[PDB]
Write an enzyme that holds these catalytic residues in place. Structure first.
Site, short mmCIF file in Angstrom:
data_model
loop_
_atom_site.label_atom_id
_atom_site.label_comp_id
_atom_site.label_asym_id
_atom_site.label_seq_id
_atom_site.Cartn_x
_atom_site.Cartn_y
_atom_site.Cartn_z
CG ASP A 216 -52.70 -21.41 -12.39
OD1 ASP A 216 -52.02 -22.45 -12.51
OD2 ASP A 216 -53.27 -21.09 -11.33
CG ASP B 116 -56.03 -12.00 -20.96
OD1 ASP B 116 -55.27 -11.32 -20.24
OD2 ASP B 116 -56.31 -13.18 -20.72
N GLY C 74 -57.75 -9.60 -16.52
CA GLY C 74 -57.98 -10.56 -17.57
C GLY C 74 -59.43 -10.91 -17.81
CG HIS D 296 -53.97 -16.75 -15.11
ND1 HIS D 296 -54.08 -17.97 -15.74
CD2 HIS D 296 -54.47 -15.83 -15.97
CE1 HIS D 296 -54.63 -17.80 -16.93
NE2 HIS D 296 -54.87 -16.51 -17.09
CG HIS E 263 -59.91 -15.17 -18.33
ND1 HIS E 263 -59.94 -15.71 -17.06
CD2 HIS E 263 -58.69 -14.60 -18.47
CE1 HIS E 263 -58.78 -15.48 -16.46
NE2 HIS E 263 -58.01 -14.81 -17.29
NE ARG F 247 -55.84 -16.53 -33.05
CZ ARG F 247 -55.70 -15.72 -34.09
NH1 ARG F 247 -54.99 -16.12 -35.15
NH2 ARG F 247 -56.27 -14.53 -34.09
CG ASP G 16 -60.94 -13.73 -22.86
OD1 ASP G 16 -61.73 -14.69 -22.89
OD2 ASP G 16 -61.31 -12.54 -22.76
#
Lengths: 144, 148, 148, 144, 151, 151
Positions: C91, C71, C66, C19, C98, C107, C101
């Site tokens: 961050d 992402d 991103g 980020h 986002h 995940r 995302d």
């Protein structure tokens, strides 16, 4: 689940948590009720504890600021039965980075059935309640 | 923000956290590395503590289950510098009620810069790392300086 | 569900994602481990690719930033077994648009069992691990079998 | 930000994504419009591609199921300008584990300005639109 | 879930909602279709509605600002069958404090099966659709049946 | 943010909302305070309201079920100053599909400064408060000023 009982001591352990833009709103509230609050045990996250201490001369147990883990410290104390009342003036008009912590703390206060106020109106209703200075029994989940 | 350092002791305080569907996964990991884990201090949420002591004979500091506040207890310890490694096998294929607590714990572990593993591959790489049994310094936010 | 294995090649395909406020953090990490990273294949989202080639001379497979879909590009690659390690310095102290995302990528990295680091401490432990330059097998969901 | 232009080909690349409880709702929709759909390029996540293929005999490019990464595969294709229309019948009455993926995919479809339908009414309005079979120009962010 | 039908009137009840960084994008779209939009019934959240009204002289029934409750007011109307089309240009590149409200509104528009557009391309496709000015039947959850099974 | 005041009437407009695993817990609380609650104006989401009405014979203005839009209907009423007290026993131990709606409703109750209880302990403290049956002034965002600065 199975519920059991816990008694909130007549002298409560109150956690005061506020987001930056609600600091004044909380300061004002604490000042206005200082006489009643002076009879209980206070905790606060971040610099708010210092602000209250310097403004009211009341002793406040300080915790880390919200973004640094303070909300989870308070959540832990709640789950251990060490916090009896939560005054959490979170900001509904600003996106905060530690939003998960905010929601988790509120989730825990709901689960452990302790009086919780997220705005002044609720806080006033709770603090003016007759049994605020009495030992009160509340139903809580029976962890065992 | 201001940064400073802190030393992760040679003998690490390790938090073991797992969701119901990842319990066997966590246990298998502990059992595969028992010899190395015997030199560290273990903490575990929910029933995991007993399962570990029963299966391995190792003593574990037990905490509340995740839904009941265990995640925040661990997060509080991390923020106070009392937990050095987090092994968190959360369930990526099931919606959990305490999802906020899960995300909050992972957020805190990231902020406080401690080794964190959310799957077996990461956990294995971390525990096999040379300095896992050594004292190592990490850069962390300087809260005291920041406060003042 | 059904599981199977897959081999992480000795020469790893590493995704470097950061980020805005963690950009210097990621660069410092790459620069501290340049010699080891020179033996692997790098991927990076946004401007990071150029910063890396300019600072280290290493070639990087660039992807979208991103917020623009980077992402998901990385997540798609992970699910296809084309990314073996994810260094994601997101961050924890800033709200990002986002965020979905970000959570989705983490995940997927958890589901597909690849080494993932979200802070410097974890990244250092992983890269210093003995088998980082070796071929290693990992247990993964058996989608093919599951499908049928 | 700076916008630029992209032309959706007359023959569109359509992604069909449905949650378990919306599989039938989507199957029905595809069947009802088969004649029009037969003129475009189809993609679907999970077993839905197989279901459509076997039920309509139409060719469908399959992707991974949602929980396994399929939503991000479609999101990637959208960001690369390879998907022109998204028919995403997500379930508003059931909590799904890959909710972040669902929200991320919808966020990307919004950012890249492609026609997106999350319910039958919207899907019908879009597919019956005059320019659905025409090359159409859309404003998109100028990545450079 | 049992489904029944509802008929969207020829003149639609359209809700126009836009986040700050998308307001100009929404205004331009409105100006571009003003003659047609004037034929329908318009609703908009606090700020959005007032800017539209001021710029085009069109009648726009204004609701509260999104953060102050406007999104829920629109959500409630959709659930009561009083809104037929939702043009919601939310900001995908900025984090908003009322994100829950935004997601809830979109969840409800999905549930009640009304035409929804979150970007210009979709909005244009919908408004150019033949039946936009016609009465059209849509399938909706049969609430009566839904409640009875819950009791 | 500029603040002004609003007066909650002596007889309050109370919204009663409970998630499935918390419905019995809410019903018991209602039964326990029925005589007092009968004096006020009651509103409830789909299922909750009907069960209360059926069990206590009390008048409860029912709204749609939460997942179908009831939470937003309640949220809209709070923002319009038509709901004065919110008793929302949401489930902290179960993931619900309409979680965004739940968070949005709680966000609005916080913004509009009305007494809100999410568990029995808080509900009891509020209902036992002296001014529960009195007209009481609360500070609320001054929307007029809020909008003007936005335009």
């Amino acid at each position: 689940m199975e519920l059991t009982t816990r008694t909130l001591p007549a002298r409560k352990h109150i956690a005061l948590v506020a987001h930056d833009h609600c600091k004044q709103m909380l300061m004002s509230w604490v000042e206005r009720h200082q006489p009643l609050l002076e009879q209980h045990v206070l905790y606060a996250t971040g610099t708010t504890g210092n602000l209250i201490s310097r403004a009211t001369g009341m002793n406040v147990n300080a915790m880390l600021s919200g973004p640094m883990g303070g909300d989870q410290q308070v959540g832990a104390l709640i789950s251990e039965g060490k916090i009896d009342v939560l005054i959490f003036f979170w900001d509904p008009l600003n996106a905060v980075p530690h939003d998960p912590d905010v929601k988790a703390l509120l989730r825990l206060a709901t689960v452990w059935n302790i009086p919780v106020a997220t705005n002044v109106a609720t806080a006033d209703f709770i603090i003016q309640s007759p049994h605020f200075n009495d030992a009160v029994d509340i139903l809580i989940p029976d962890y065992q």
